[PDB]
Structure formats: structure tokens, C-alpha cells
Amino acid sequence: SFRYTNGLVGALKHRMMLESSHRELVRRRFTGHCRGVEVVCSGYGTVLAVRLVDKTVWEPFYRLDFERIAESIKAALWDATRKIRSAKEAALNRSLSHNQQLRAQAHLEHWYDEDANTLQPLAFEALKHEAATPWMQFVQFGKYKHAAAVMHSEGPCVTALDEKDVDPTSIPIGSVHPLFLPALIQFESRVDNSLNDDAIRQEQRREMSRDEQLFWERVELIRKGQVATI
């Protein structure tokens, strides 16, 4: 029994780890390097900077030709990008490998439906997270305590994130399952990011009260039928 709750435990473990990966790949930089170029990029693909080498030994190689220059620029930028991509794939290949329930629900397609083109941090949702300002980088990420604290006062996504926000066994519901964030909000509390227990239990017992009237209507009716026909 409880195969639903077991698969749900699994999907939430999977998504917990995947959001840990999201903010882990946030709180870092990545760097491509193909010929003389050092392209440092964010976790969301934004080009942070493009440097050369200290001794610049590729200078007898570029002589400024501009053709090899653009070639190596895009090549190292793609290098940093494929770095980020394979890291987002690895942070998933670890999760699925170390999920005991997603491996009991044996499927190959697990290793394939999610990839660095679809896991939560993406390069086109970049601006709304990077160019965000402190309160909003708190509220996106679901830190309303810190958001209220900052309201009571490039790509700078590293501002809001700290090592506690990369331990998946702490990050709240709206971020753990973002595919359903506008529907888990009503159980995301405002003061603390914890669960709104009065919300969840009140909603449950309203629905339970309703269903009870529904049930007793049916006992009344089916008994009327038993009396009528019997």
C-alpha cells in the first residue's frame, strides 16, 4: 500500500536534489578556455567576463587576425557553457542514481526526460533572476524572512544565496516543486517559508465536511431505494 505516497516521496527527493543543484550552480562561476580566451560565465549563461592569458603566448598565433580571435572566443564560451550543461546533467545523473525509489520504479526514461536544457536554471530565464534586486531575489527564491529584513532597510545572483540555501533538506515547497509553485503557495507561509499548517488542515477539513454531507445524502438515498424495492 501507499504506492502513491512512496512515489511522491521519491519525486520530492528528486526535485529537492535538483533544486539544490539549481542554487549550487548559482553560487559559482564557470570558465571556458579554447585559445588564449578565459570566458567566465554565470550559472545562467550570462558572460561575466572575457580575459586573455597573463603571458599571452597565443600572441604569435593571433599575431590581430580577428578570425581566429572570434573562433576561439566562441569556442571557449561554448566550452564554459558545456561545462555548465554537463554539470547540470551530472547534478541530475547523481540524483537519479542515488534515488532509491526512482530506481525501484525502474525506467530508463528517467535518465532522459530531464537534461540541462530543461532543469530549473536555464539561460533564457537568466535576466529575471540575475538582474533582480535584493528583495526580489529573496522572494523569487522564496526567502520572505530575508525579503522582509531587506525591505526594512553584472548578474549578481550570488547576493541572495548562501550555503544553507544549497542544503536541499531545508528549501521550502514552492521551490522544491516549481512546476506547481502557484498552487503550493497557499501552503507556503508568509512569515516563515515553512508550511502553512492552518492553511493545509483547514482546507482539508472543509473538504472533509463537504464530502460527509455528500456521503450521507447517498446513504439516505440508497436506503430509500432499499426500502422502496425490497
Binding site: 504506492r3 512512496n6 512515489g7 525501484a104 520504479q105 525502474a106
Partner: peptide, 8 residues
């Protein structure tokens, strides 16, 4: 069946 690999 709890999952396809219950007897695995």
C-alpha cells in the same frame, strides 16, 4: 504491485 521491480 508496488512497482515493476517488486520481486526484483
Amino acid at each position: 504491485r508496488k512497482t515493476q521491480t517488486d520481486e526484483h
